[PDB]
Ligand binder design. Sequence first.
Ligand SMILES: CO[C@H]1CCCC[C@@H](c2ccccc2)OC(=O)[C@@H](C)[C@@]2(O)O[C@H]([C@@H](C)[C@H](O)[C@H]2OC)[C@@H](C)/C=C/[C@H]1OC
Length: 549
Amino acid sequence: MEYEITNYSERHTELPGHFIGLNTVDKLEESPLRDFVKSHGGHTVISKILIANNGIAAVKEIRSVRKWAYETFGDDRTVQFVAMATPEDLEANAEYIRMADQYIEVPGGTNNNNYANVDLIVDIAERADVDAVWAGWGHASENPLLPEKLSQSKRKVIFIGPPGNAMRSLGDKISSTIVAQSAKVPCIPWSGTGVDTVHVDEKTGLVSVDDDIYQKGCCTSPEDGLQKAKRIGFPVMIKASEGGGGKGIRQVEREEDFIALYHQAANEIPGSPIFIMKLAGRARHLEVQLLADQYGTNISLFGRDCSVQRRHQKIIEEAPVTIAKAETFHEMEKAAVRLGKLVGYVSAGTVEYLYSHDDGKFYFLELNPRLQVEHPTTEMVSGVNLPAAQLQIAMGIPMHRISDIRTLYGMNPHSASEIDFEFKTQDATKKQRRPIPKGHCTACRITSEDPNDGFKPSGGTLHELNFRSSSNVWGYFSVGNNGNIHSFSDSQFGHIFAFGENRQASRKHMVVALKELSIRGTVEYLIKLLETEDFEDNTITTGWLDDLI
Ligand SMILES: CO[C@H]1CCCC[C@@H](c2ccccc2)OC(=O)[C@@H](C)[C@@]2(O)O[C@H]([C@@H](C)[C@H](O)[C@H]2OC)[C@@H](C)/C=C/[C@H]1OC
């Protein structure tokens, strides 16, 4: 078969070498896959992928890509998958291992010994002679050394995700906020407000902040920090930029406690720079789904509202966002895009925001440089197969030649016409359709207890739920093997996704599914949360669930 043609050869010359793989279209024999990549403007044929993950992540990657492969080439194995298999996963007969076209055994224990071990991943990538590695979420997905070492290999292995430079462009909290401010993204009042000068390596695009600028947002002494705190207004947070987890951080309610608490945080992470920031109160946590190709094009795929949290853990999330005014969320989308373009982002990513419904303002929190477990919420309302889009982007195919994206913008999916994603001109508004979310999706995190008792557990590590009473709901529970904290566990986590024509409908469908599920040997509190007046009226906040407890 033939396709409409895109010639991006000039643009290919500008791309950093780490984007280019070994099997480039120019020196490759004709084939369905090669023809597709070439005609669509891509540079490298990715026909074999190593999955540096397990559980639901590995299963989702395989199913999403194989579905795209089948729809596109009539052969769902056009792009092969190699799996990494720990003794724990092998012993549990994990589905992803059985699904993969091939697999390689790896050491057990915590993930630093396997799925998150960069050197091992690179070694296996070479041994398996793969074209690319997909990490997804968790494990080493956010480790810049992964794409860097993969590209340094003589096998020139591609990373299906953002480049190391993009991940590094957003360093500690201080450097990260300054970069955001340089991209004109509103940030929470802090000791560095106004500091927005960044340095971009004219050759690598790596974004950094010179020491003389970085220090502009740091405290020179406890007394200096107090002065900065007074200006910002109490309560504030004292934070050591090099702080780990919950160390090097202290909330200050009153001036009188500042100095003492400053030393407490400083002493936990000695020598670390310290910055002051206003304390976020009960508000909203919104996310913008970012998708970027290798040619500077960053777009948003609407967003998600994950305000309902417990101990900072997302429990209930929905897409698209509805609490914010349409134009205000569009501003969050645009700011996310500005940031993505600045750090040279590529692939899927999320920009998190703090949003106050009382005054309608929003503030940057962070950019998670990875695809998230709850991504199907966004996939459902946008119609975009995200793992397939990531794969095409990794092959060098531009945003406008990704079929699901063309469909989202109301274009003929077979056409090669350029798309103006910013709708800047009358011509663009004439040939394109502004994306509109299709329906609504509610996602709930669910937990289960399946103690390891010697008895052979139900085969597989991904237990799927096929609801008999609901038509718009799907869910799963997964055995947590080889985590960073637990190599195996009695507890099992998962998610349930429910679709509806609108917020009320998806909510209703979720409740119906949960009730059906509750007829099994957990989700009882979820049903109550979903049927509360506050949730129904959408008057919840980031502190809502914690206040109920
Ligand atoms: C682990 O694999 C599960 C994942 C299900 C995720 C929930 C489900 C859904 C969302 C909301 C409500 C109900 C169900 O989302 C979907 O089915 C949609 C969005 C989606 O993920 O389907 C997958 C792809 C075509 C693509 O990525 C995307 O389509 C654009 C296919 C491969 C389905 C795989 C499933 O296995 C059969």
